[PDB]
Amino acid sequence: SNNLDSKVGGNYNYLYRLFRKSNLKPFERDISTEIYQAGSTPCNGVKGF
C-alpha cells in the first residue's frame, strides 16, 4: 500500500497494539488505551516506571 498510505516524515495515523496481558481470541477487537503493567508493580494514572 506504499503509494497511498506512506508519508515522508511518517504517516503516524496508523496504530497497532504492542503491550497487553494476554493474547486475544479469534475475531476479537480490543479498543483499550489503558496503561500496561510491564513490572511486578501495579501501575496507576497516566504513566510510570
Partner 1 sequence: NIDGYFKIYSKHTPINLVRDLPQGFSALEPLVDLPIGINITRFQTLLA
Ligand X SMILES: *[C@@H]1O[C@H](CO)[C@@H](O[C@@H]2O[C@H](CO)[C@@H](O)[C@H](O)[C@H]2NC(C)=O)[C@H](O)[C@H]1NC(C)=O
Told to check if 27 binds partner 1 by CB under 8 A, we report: yes
Size of the site for ligand X (CB under 6 A): 2
Query: Using the rule CB under 8 A, is 26 a contact of partner 1?
Result: yes
Place of cell 497494539: 17
Q: Which residue in the block uniquely carries the three cell numbers 476479537?
A: 28
The item of ligand X, partner 1, none sharing an interface with residue 9, based on CB under 5 to 8 Å by kind, is none
Residue 26: contacted member of ligand X, partner 1, none (CB under 5 to 8 Å, by partner type): partner 1
Contacts 24+ apart (CB under 8 A), 18-27: none
Residues sharing a CB contact under 8 Å with residue 41, sequence separation 6 or more, in sequence order: 48, 49
Residue 24 CB, nearest distance to partner 1 (Å)?
12
